[PDB]
Amino acid sequence: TYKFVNMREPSMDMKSVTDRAAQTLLWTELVRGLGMTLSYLFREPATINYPFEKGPLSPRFRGEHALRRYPSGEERCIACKLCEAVCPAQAITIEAEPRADGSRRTTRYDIDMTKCIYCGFCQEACPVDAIVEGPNFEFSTETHEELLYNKEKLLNNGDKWEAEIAANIQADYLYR
Amino acid sequence: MNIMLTLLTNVTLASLLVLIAFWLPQLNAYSEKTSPFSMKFFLVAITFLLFDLEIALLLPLPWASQTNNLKTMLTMALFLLILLAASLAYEWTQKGLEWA
Amino acid sequence: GRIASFLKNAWAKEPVLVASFAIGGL
Amino acid sequence: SRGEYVVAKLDDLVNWARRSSLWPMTFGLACCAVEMMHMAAPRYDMDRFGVVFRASPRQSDVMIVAGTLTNKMAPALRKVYDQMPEPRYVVSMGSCANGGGYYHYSYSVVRGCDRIVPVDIYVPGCPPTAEALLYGILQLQRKIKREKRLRIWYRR
Amino acid sequence: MFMINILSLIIPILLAVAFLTLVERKVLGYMQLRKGPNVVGPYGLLQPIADALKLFTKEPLRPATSSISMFIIAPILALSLALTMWVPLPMPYPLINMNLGVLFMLAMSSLAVYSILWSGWASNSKYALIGALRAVAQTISYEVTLAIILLSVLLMNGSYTLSTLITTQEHIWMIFTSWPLAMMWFISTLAETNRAPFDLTEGESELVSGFNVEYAAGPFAMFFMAEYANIIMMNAFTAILFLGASHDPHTPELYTINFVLKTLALTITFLWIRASYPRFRYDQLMHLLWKSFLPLTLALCMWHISLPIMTASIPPQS
Amino acid sequence: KVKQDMPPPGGYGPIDYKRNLPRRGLSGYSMFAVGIGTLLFGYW
Ligand code: SF4
Ligand code: SF4
C-alpha cells in the first residue's frame, strides 16, 4: 500500500566506501548526467517546421465559431437562443425577428471572441448544428475590435470553412 | 613598444565601441521613460588578501627549484605551504570560514 | 583499532581532507 | 530618389533585425503561460525564429500578457511595460487578457489589457494553442516588417 | 605590420565570439530536443548579425545617474582586457612573447573583475550592487585556487613563459601528469568566467539580470562579447596548459588547427555543462572552493614541488 | 453492432513503471588503480 522513498542504508564495507569516495572525488554521477545530455544531443530533435508543418489535431477540435447553412443554402440557426443561455461567458448576443418569408431567423448574432472561453458549449447545444467551432485556430487580429464577430463574419467563416467543418462533423457526429 | 602598441590599440578599440554604443544609438528619436547592509562576511575578502600574500610568496618557486641547496629550498617551501594549510585549518575549525 | 575507525569515518565523511593529508604527508 | 532608396533599404535592415531577434519577457500570469511554455517546448520551439525568453524587462522587446490581468496586478504590469525599452510591442494572449474572458464581469478583473497598455496583436483562445501563439508572433514579425520609420522620417 | 597583426588577432576573435553565441544557442537547443536558430540565414548563420543590429538599434536606457564615468569605463575595461588577454597566447607563436605571460594573464583576469565591480555599483540599484558584491567574492574565491593550480602545473614547465608549454608537452599531454589539478583548474575556469553552474553573478533565475540589469543596447553587447571572449580565452589557456599539441616548426598550420579544435571542444564542454547541471548556491559555491578544493590544491602543490626533486626531473629554466 | 474504443481482447501489454537506473562503471579500486597507473607512467 505504501512504499519508502529514501530509507536506505549505505554499506560500510571497504569496497562500497571506496566506490563512494571515488564518486565524490572523481565526479562519476556528474559524468553520468553529462552522458545523458550528450545522448540527447545525438537524438533527433522534435521540432516541427511551423508554419510549413502543422501540429496534429482531432476532429473534435474547438476553434473559431462558424455559422453553418443547410445544403439548400438556408442558414441553419433558428433563433432558439439556447446557445446564449448555455454560453458560460455570455459572449453570444442573439436578436431575432420574423423575416419576410415568415421563418424564424436571427437579425443579430454576435460572438465576442474576446469574452468567449472556447468551452465547446452551443456547438453541443444548438439543436440544428448552427454554431460549430471550426478547425481554424490562426485567426489572430491586430485590433481588439476585429475579434468582436458579427453575424456576417460568422456566416462568412462558415462559408469559408464548410468543406472542412462538414467532414469533421461527419467524423464525429456518431460519437455525439 | 610592441606591448604599448597592443595596449593602446585594444583600449582605443574598446572605447571606440563604447562610443558607437553610448552616443551613436542615443541619437535615435524617442520620448520620456521616467526612471546597503553591513556585510560582516567581508571577512572572507580579508582572508583572501592574506592568502593572496602567500600566493605572491610562492610564485618564485619555479626559479627556486634551480638552486644547489635544494634541501633548504624544499624545507622552506613546504614550511610556507604547511603554514598556509595551518592558517586555513585554523580558520576552518574556529568557524572563521563562515561564508555567506 | 580506533585509528582504523577514525580513518573509515574520515574517508566516509571528509574524503577530500583525507586525500589532501595523505598527499601532503607523502 | 536615391535618398529614398537608401532610406528604404536601411529601414528594411532595421526591421529585419528587430523582427528576427524578438525577445519576449518572461511574463505569464495565468493558464496561458502553460501554452506559452509549450510554445517554448521543443515541438514549436520559438528559439528557431529568434524568439528567446529574457527575464529583464530592460533586455526585452515584446510583452506577452498571458493570463487574467487582475486589478491588483495591473499597476505592476504597467510599470514593467514602462521600464521596457523601445521599440516595444505587446501581444495579448487569451480571452482573459484580450477582453476579460471568463471573468469579464468580475470585480477584481481588468476587462482587457488594452485598457492598461497598448496592444499590437491579439491572440484569441482560452487557452490559445501554442500554434496559435506562434502564429500571432509571426504576425507581429510581419507587422514589424511593414514598418516604415525611416521612410516617414525622410518624408519630413 | 605589427598593427596588422593586432587587428588579425582582434577582429577574428570578435567574429568567433559572435558565432559562438549561435553555436551555444544551437547546442543547447539540440541537447533540449530543440533546434537552434535556423530561420535567420542558412542554418542560422545570420542570427548574430540580427541580434547585434537589434541590440544597437534598441533604446539606450540609463537611469544610473551616478558616476557615469564608471558606468562607461566598466564595459570599456571588460572588453579591452578580454581582447588583451588573447595577446600573449602562443598559437603557436605569441603576438607578444613575455617571460611571464602567465602571471600577466592572471593579473589581467584579476583586473577584469573591476568591470563587474564598477558596473554594478555605478548602476546604483539593489540587485546590481549586491550581485556585484557576490561577483567579487566568487572571482576572488576561485582566483586563489586558479593561481595555486597554475603554479603547481608550471612547476613542470620550469617558467611562466607560455611558449615553453609546447616544448614541455611535446611527448605527452600534461593532463596525464596532473589530471586532478586539471579537473580543479577546469572548474576554476568555470567559476572565473561566471558560467553555469557558477553563473551566480548574472544569475537570471535569482537576480533579474545581475550586474548588467541596468545595461542595455551596446554596453550590454560589450559585456556579452567580453564574457564570451573570456570563455574562449580561458578554454584556449586550458588547451595550451594541459592538452598540448604537436608543433612542426616549418608548418605552424598543423598546431594551429589542433589547438583551435581543442579549444572548440572545451568551449562545447562549457555549453554542455551549462545545459546539464543546475546552479550551485552562492554559499555552496564558496564551500566547494575554500573548504573542499583549496586543501587538495595545497597537497598537490606540495607533491608537485617534491616530485621533480625526488624524480630528478627539474625542468630547464631556459 | 456495438463499437466503442475498447481495450483489445486480452488487454494491452504490460507497461514498465519502475526505476531502471542501470548499474554502470568500474569499481572504485579499479578507477583509482587506473588513475595512479597513468600518473606513474606520466611521471616516468
Ligand atoms: S465556446 Fe465561447 S461562444 Fe460558445 S458557448 Fe462557450 S463561451 Fe460561449
Ligand atoms: S483566457 Fe483561458 S487559459 Fe487564458 S488566462 Fe483566461 S481562463 Fe486561463
Relative to beta strand A104-111, strand D121-123 is unpaired
The rounded distance, in Å, linking the Cα atoms of E120 and E117 is 6
Place of cell 495591473: D74
Query: E strand or H helix at A92, and its extent?
Result: strand A92-98
E5: left (phi over 0), alpha (psi -120 to 50) or beta: alpha
Instruction: Assess A41–E contact: CB distance below 8 Å, yes or no.
Output: yes
Q: Measured between alpha carbons, how far is E161 from E226 in angstroms, rounded to an integer?
A: 25
* Residues A154, A134: Cα–Cα separation, whole Å: 10
Q: How many CA atoms lie within 13 A of B90 on its CB side?
A: 7
How many angstroms is it from D128 CA to the middle of ligand 2? 8
Rounded CA separation E50/D14 (Å): 9
Q: How do the residues of chain F divide into helix, strand and coil, expressed in percent and rounded to 5? A: 35, 0, 65
Look up the CATH architecture of domain B1-94. Answer: Up-down Bundle (1.20)
Whole-number Å distance between alpha carbons of B66 and E314: 8
- Can you give the three-state secondary structure of D93-114, one letter per residue? ECHHHHHCHHHCCCCCECCCHH
**What is the SS3 string spanning E139-187?**
HHHHHHHHHHHHHHHHHHHCCCCCCHHHHHCCCCCHHHHHHHHHHHHHH
Which atom number of ligand 1 is nearest to the Cα of residue A88? Answer: 7
H-type helices in chain A, by residue range?
Answer: 14-26, 28-42, 82-86, 151-172
Three-state secondary structure call for residue E90: strand
Give the chain A residue nearest D41 (alpha carbons): A47
Residue E275: list chain A partners with CB under 8 A. Answer: 37
Run of H or E including E271:
helix E252-276
Q: What residues contact E245, with CB distance under 8 A and at least 6 apart?
A: E92, E166, E239, E255, E258, E259, E262
Q: Which atom of ligand 2 is nearest to the CA of D98?
A: 1
DSSP per-residue letters across B41-90: GGHHHHHHHHHHHHHHHHTTHHHHTTSS-HHHHHHHHHHHHHHHHHHHHH
Query: Residues A87, A131: contact at Cβ < 8 Å?
Result: no
Quick one: which H or E segment has residue B93? helix B70-93
With CA atoms as reference, the chain D residue closest to B30 would be: D86
3-state helix vs strand vs coil in chain A, percent to 5: 35, 10, 55
Q: How far is the CA of A133 from the centre of ligand 1 (A)?
A: 9
Question: Per-residue DSSP letters for chain D?
Answer: -HHHHHHHHHHHHHHHHHHHS--BB--B-STHHHHHHHHHSSTT-GGGGT---BS-STT-SEEEEES--BTTTHHHHHHHHHHS-SS-EEEEESHHHHH-GGGTT-TTB-S-GGGTS--SEEE--SSPPHHHHHHHHHHHHHHHHT--HHHHHHT-
Closest residue CA from atom 6 of ligand 1? A119
CB atoms C23 and E295 under 8 Å: no
Angle subtended at Cα E241 by Cα E236 and Cα E242, rounded to the nearest 5 degrees: 105
For residue A112, which atom of ligand 1 is closest to its CA?
Answer: 3
Per this entry, what is the length of chain D? 156
What's the CA gap between E240 and E260, in Å, rounded?
A: 10
**Residues sharing a CB contact under 8 Å with residue A109, sequence separation 6 or more, in sequence order:** A67, A77, A92, A93, A94, A95, A150, A151, A154
Contact E296 C20 (CB under 8 A): yes
Q: What number of CA atoms fall less than 13 Å from residue E285's CA on the CB side?
A: 27
Please compute, for residue B83, the number of CA atoms within 13 A of its CA located in the half-sphere on the CB side: 12
Sign of the Cα torsion D126, D130, D131, D134 reads: positive
Distance CA E32, CA A130 (A): 45
Using DSSP bridges, classify how beta strands A104-111 and A92-98 pair: parallel, antiparallel or unpaired. Answer: antiparallel
Coil, helix or strand for A75?
A: strand
- The C-alpha atoms of residue E145 and residue E187 are separated, in whole angstroms, by 10
Question: In Å, how far from its chain's centre is CA E271?
Answer: 13
Find, among E76, E7, E19, the residue nearest to E44 by Cα.
E19
Of B6, B10, B44, the CB nearest to E137: B44
Closest partner residue to A142 (CB to CB) among D45, D120, D135 is D120
Nearest CA in chain E to D138: E39
The H or E element spanning position E102 is helix E101-123
Q: How far is CA B51 from the centre of its chain?
A: 11
What is the structure's resolution, reported in angstroms to one decimal?
3.5
Q: Between chain F and chain C, are at least 3 CB pairs below 8 A?
A: no
D41 neighbors D132 (Cβ within 8 angstroms): no
How far apart (Å, rounded) are the C-alpha atoms in residues E249 and E244? 15
Residue E302 and residue C26: Cα distance in Å, rounded? Answer: 9
CA D129, distance to chain mean position in Å, is 16
F38 interfaces chain A, CB cutoff of 8 Å? no
- CA neighbor of D65 nearest in space, from D128, D146, D135: D128
Cell representation of residue A72 = 439548400
Q: Are strands D62-66 and A104-111 parallel, antiparallel or unpaired?
A: unpaired
CA angle E220, D25, D94 (to 5 degrees): 165
**In angstroms, rounded to a whole number, what is the distance separating the alpha carbons of residues E242 and E231?**
16
Q: Cα B85 vs. chain centroid, distance in angstroms?
A: 20
Residues 6+ apart with CB under 8 A from E235: E189, E263, E266, E267, E269, E270
List the beta strands (DSSP E) in chain E: none
One-letter-per-residue 3-state SS of A98-116: ECCCCCEEEEEEEEECCCC
Q: Does A15 contact F31 at a Cβ distance shorter than 8 Å?
A: no
User: What phi and psi values does residue F42 have, to the nearest 5 degrees?
Assistant: -60, -40
Give the residue, by CA position, lying nearest to ligand 1 atom 7.
A116
Q: Which residues partner with A96 through β-bridges?
A: A106
Contact E138, E287 (CB under 8 A): no
β-bridge partners, D65: D92
For the record, the C-alpha cell of A91 comes out as: 459572449
What 3-state DSSP class applies to E22?
A: helix
Amino acid at A80: C
F1 at interface of A, judged by CB pairs closer than 8 A: no
Q: List C-alpha distances in Å: D131 to A136, D36, D75.
A: 11, 10, 30
Mode of pairing for the β-strands spanning A92-98 and D89-93: unpaired
**Cell numbers at E28, concatenated:** 543547447
- Dist. CA D127–CA D131, nearest whole Å: 11
A45 interfacial to chain D (CB closer than 8 Å): yes
Compute the distance between CA of residue F36 and CA of residue F44 in angstroms, rounded to an integer.
12
Q: Name the experiment that determined this structure.
A: cryo-EM
Is the Cβ–Cβ distance between E263 and E115 less than 8 Å? no
Question: What backbone phi and psi angles, to 5 degrees, belong to B80?
Answer: -65, -45
User: What is the CB < 6 Å shell around ligand 1?
Assistant: A 65, 86-89, 91-92, 111, 116-122
Return the domain boundaries, chain B.
1-94
Strands of the sheet with D62-66, listed across from one edge: D62-66, D89-93, D121-123
DSSP category for residue F16: -
What Cα–Cα distance (Å) separates residue A10 from each residue in A13, E208, F23?
9, 41, 15
* Nearest-neighbour CA in chain E from B42: distance (Å): 9
The annotation status of D113 as a binding-site residue, yes or no, is no
Cell of A76: 441553419
